[PDB]
From a paper:
Here we present for the first time the structure of the substrate peptide, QRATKM containing the scissile peptide bond, bound to the active enzyme. The crystal structure has been determined to 1.5Å resolution. The final refined model contains 423 protease residues, 6 substrate residues, one sulfate and one zinc ions and 375 waters. The electron density in the residual map (Fo-Fc) was well defined for the hexapeptide and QRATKM could be modeled unambiguously except for the side chains of K and M. It appears that K could take two rotamer positions. This is the first time an uncleavable substrate bound structure of an active botulinum neurotoxin has been reported and it has helped in unequivocally defining S1 to S5′ sites. Most notably, the amino nitrogen and carbonyl oxygen of P1 residue (Gln197) chelate the zinc ion. The amino nitrogen has replaced the nucleophilic water as was shown earlier. The side chain of P1-Q197 is exposed to the solvent region but makes a hydrogen bond with Glu164 OE1. While SN/A1 was cleavable by [name], SN/A2 was not, suggesting that the N terminal DEAN is required for cleavage. This probably explains why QRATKM which lacks DEAN was not cleaved in our case even though we used up to 1∶30 ratio of Balc424 to peptide. However, the major reason for the peptide not being cleaved is the amino group chelating zinc.
Numbering used by the authors:
A (entry chain B): 197 to 202
B (entry chain A): 1 to 423
The structure:
Amino acid sequence: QRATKM
Amino acid sequence: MPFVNKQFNYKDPVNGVDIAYIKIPNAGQMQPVKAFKIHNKIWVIPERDTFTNPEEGDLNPPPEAKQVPVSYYDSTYLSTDNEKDNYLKGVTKLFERIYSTDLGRMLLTSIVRGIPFWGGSTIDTELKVIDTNCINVIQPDGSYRSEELNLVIIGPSADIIQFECKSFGHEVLNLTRNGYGSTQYIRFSPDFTFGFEESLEVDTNPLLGAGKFATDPAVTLAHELIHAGHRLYGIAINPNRVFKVNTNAYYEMSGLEVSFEELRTFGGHDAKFIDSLQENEFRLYYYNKFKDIASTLNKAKSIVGTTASLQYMKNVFKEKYLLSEDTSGKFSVDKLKFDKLYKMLTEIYTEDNFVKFFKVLNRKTYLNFDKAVFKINIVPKVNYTIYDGFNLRNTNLAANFNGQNTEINNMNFTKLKNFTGLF
Ligand SMILES: [Zn+2]
């Protein structure tokens, strides 16, 4: 997953 | 020598072998999509992913007033032949860039050898494939033939920047966490990239920076390939096991929890947030899963289907899991061999290590804040190459990561959205 959501 | 021995063009005629219309086992209906087999066990589908998840088949962006901070929508992206041609060429170039490094060659080799386990049989004496680890390929005669595969690179779903590994589950088995493994569908795009900041205190702050430097998409794809490797070997850490971040005040005020799977994948100092106790727990847990596989293989006396022989498939899995074989031909898991493979897949293949091989600037931790999303085009060699990425040798972009500097190499980046200050 590219990033945590932020 | 190249990883992809054919420079495919999206418009090349289908042949029913490596250029064909296919359907995926999503337990639903779908029109066949044109796909390209770029390497043994690896396919590319230049389409937006409205297939792996039934509830995510709408690319239409909800009302502007219902959009989160870090996300980007464009229902028209990847809808034309030219875009698909560029997508295919972009993904191919990134595989070559990754394969050009020793670390990338090691990772891709592990991925190709990581065939999803044949655990679809309900009878212990028979070894059978799991249908969801295959795709149905339309042959020249119009009939469908089932082909096993390990990896599929597909376009993103509605949220274009939400790259991640998706795979079909089992009714009873947790394929990505029980040692079995499953075919991985990586939602990814080589047509966009993300900005980050050169100063750690700025990159890890949600209110500062506009995203001066651009992440090399080869690192982004490598990150997903690392997850894919974990999932293909069935050793992914349950996403419920997380680090309730308490090392960043901004993460804390938002109660942001990051999965250990992500920290492991990034590597470097991030991996240290998983304490020794937990690390040993997981190592033991997966060691036990490999043992279950060895036992299952030993019970199998006949193979199901006419695609391969039992002796061949047993050898395939002996090699995948590096099992030991005794006189009677019985399999067992050697603790030393397991630890070595487990460590290779979890500590050697990491984002931080890939950064070292590519010699690029990159975020220093996964625990940061996104800055911006840029539109890019890595297909032209004057823009990006297999060997230098954006930092083209013998040009003003060769030094100081000038190629990744969106201000200096502005012609290669178009900022589509700023994320800073929106959190
Ligand atoms: Zn990730």
